[PDB]
Amino acid sequence: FHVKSGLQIKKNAIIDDYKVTSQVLGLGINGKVLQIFNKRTQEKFALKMLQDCPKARREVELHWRASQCPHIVRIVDVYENLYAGRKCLLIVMECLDGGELFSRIQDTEREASEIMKSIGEAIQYLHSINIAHRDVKPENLLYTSKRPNAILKLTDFGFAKETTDKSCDMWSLGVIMYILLCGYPPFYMKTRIRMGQYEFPNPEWSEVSEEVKMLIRNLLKTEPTQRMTITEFMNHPWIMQSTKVPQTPLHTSRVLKED
Ligand SMILES: O=C1NCCc2[nH]c(-c3ccnc(-c4cnc5ccccc5c4)c3)cc21
């Protein structure tokens, strides 16, 4: 009987339990994401502040429900406090030092696969509990530590929605796969997207498998109704047998330096 705990919205001042700094870890609709410190443990965390409305109350829900998945930024506590006489919801999540996915890169196929593979699990988890993330841009994929065995983790649930939408998550997955392999988006716009107008031009892509190209093409189908389901993405070999992919090298770092 493996029951994880429910969600507890603490009412004590958050300042009773953490020291809040002004280092800013991220920007978003609701203002800044602040680095804060657990007093008892002197460990570091990210703080997100929402105005308490029912939208806020819906993020926190989904995220919290989503949190017990290893590839999704984990919520550690949630408070309701007053701020300038306004109810707010404070989310305290795990702090992810490694910074944004791509930035790390700018410093191998197979390495690419592993990433896609982990991002897959994030979606797979979400989809199986009926949550569509929507906003799976690469800004929202952060690493736990600069240490190069760090884990890639998805964040930012400002646009999460219940599905009791998913096909558009797989789009992002395809765009992110794209940019991982060549170094730029498939779109160099509003009109080229609706059409499904994009190349695998060379010598950037000349070395890349038709196995891989197919897959991307299936993720970037203009028509949602048969873009690939996450369940199939994860079953597809490139991702499925992750480590037996050829360690064939790619220019992605160079290009994202150049660009
Ligand atoms: O929900 C969000 N929306 C807006 C952007 C954002 N960043 C975060 C976030 C969450 C956890 N950690 C970070 C983070 C931690 N450490 C960093 C070090 C250096 C650069 C960026 C960092 C980001 C950011 C959450 C959100």
UniProtKB/Swiss-Prot annotation:
Tissue expression per record: Expressed in all tissues examined.
Keywords, comma-separated and alphabetical: ATP-binding, Cytoplasm, DNA damage, Isopeptide bond, Kinase, Nucleotide-binding, Nucleus, Phosphoprotein, Serine/threonine-protein kinase, Transferase, Ubl conjugation
Location of Phosphoserine modifications: 242
MF (Gene Ontology): ATP binding; calcium-dependent protein serine/threonine kinase activity; calcium/calmodulin-dependent protein kinase activity; calmodulin binding; mitogen-activated protein kinase binding; protein kinase activity; protein serine kinase activity; protein serine/threonine kinase activity
Domain of life: Eukaryota
Active site per UniProt: 135 (proton acceptor)
Binding of staurosporine, residues: 94-96
UniProt catalytic activity: L-seryl-[protein] + ATP = O-phospho-L-seryl-[protein] + ADP + H(+); L-threonyl-[protein] + ATP = O-phospho-L-threonyl-[protein] + ADP + H(+)
UniProt KW Ion transport keyword: no
Modified residues annotated as Phosphothreonine in this record: 248
Name the UniProt record assigns to this protein: MAP kinase-activated protein kinase 2
Organism: Homo sapiens
Span of the entire protein shown here: 46 to 345 of 400
